[PDB]
Write a protein that binds this ligand. Sequence first.
Ligand SMILES: O=C1CCc2c(Oc3ccc4c(c3)[C@@H]3[C@H](O4)[C@H]3c3nc4cc(C(F)(F)F)ccc4[nH]3)ccnc2N1
Length: 253
Amino acid sequence: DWEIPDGQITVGQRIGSGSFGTVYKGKWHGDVAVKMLNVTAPTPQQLQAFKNEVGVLRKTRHVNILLFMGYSTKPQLAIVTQWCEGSSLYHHLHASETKFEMKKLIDIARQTARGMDYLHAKSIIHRDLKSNNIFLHEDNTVKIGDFGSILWMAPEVIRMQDSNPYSFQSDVYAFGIVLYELMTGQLPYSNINNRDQIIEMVGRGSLSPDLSKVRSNCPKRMKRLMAECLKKKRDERPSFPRILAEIEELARE
Ligand SMILES: O=C1CCc2c(Oc3ccc4c(c3)[C@@H]3[C@H](O4)[C@H]3c3nc4cc(C(F)(F)F)ccc4[nH]3)ccnc2N1
């Protein structure tokens, strides 16, 4: 079982605080990272907001997913993961002037590919793939997870067609936008300066990322796979085994 008895985890420094919960850096047989719920007695609605997150976590065992280690029940509900060190891909590309090199941009794209590939085989749809949900552990090892947003939302997701628009292809579209960030350097819709403008225009297909902003030494394979991931219709996008294959094939240069 993965339940961690009360008192085993010395909850150390607070890292991030949200209205929902709070992420502390902790100590348990080494450095860990605990995500707690700021409620004494949780409602059944949020009870299994915790029970569900756990399930999808204990199903993962990949180098490029955040390592689940266990969960606490008392005194408050808590998820326990490995303790990563460094910044997210977002901090690196947009908040810091990280002088990233082409080989390493491809490698980050490749690790993310492998990571997202593994989720899909386990039939796990992320629903929020983005640059700041991708942690660069030791500024090398990519760890995918939920570390907390419309810029990565596919047109059909922006429209909220029916109930859930979230699918494997929604993650594919998001992945493209990550490739866009790696290959251009900036975020998409850099010139549009209104959130409500991005939602409306993408919703009618009148707006899409500017693909003429990528680096010069952006490999043509990657330029085209990027386009393929951003096809406006969900069923035109490539699946991750296709993607992993393509990226890994060009990475061997
Ligand atoms: O500097 C920092 C602060 C944030 C942080 C960490 O924050 C977290 C601590 C605990 C924690 C999380 C994030 C979220 C929850 O519990 C982790 C999580 N991983 C997930 C992976 C998935 C998926 F991969 F899609 F299956 C889904 C939900 C997930 N939730 C953990 C490790 N290193 C760092 N680095």
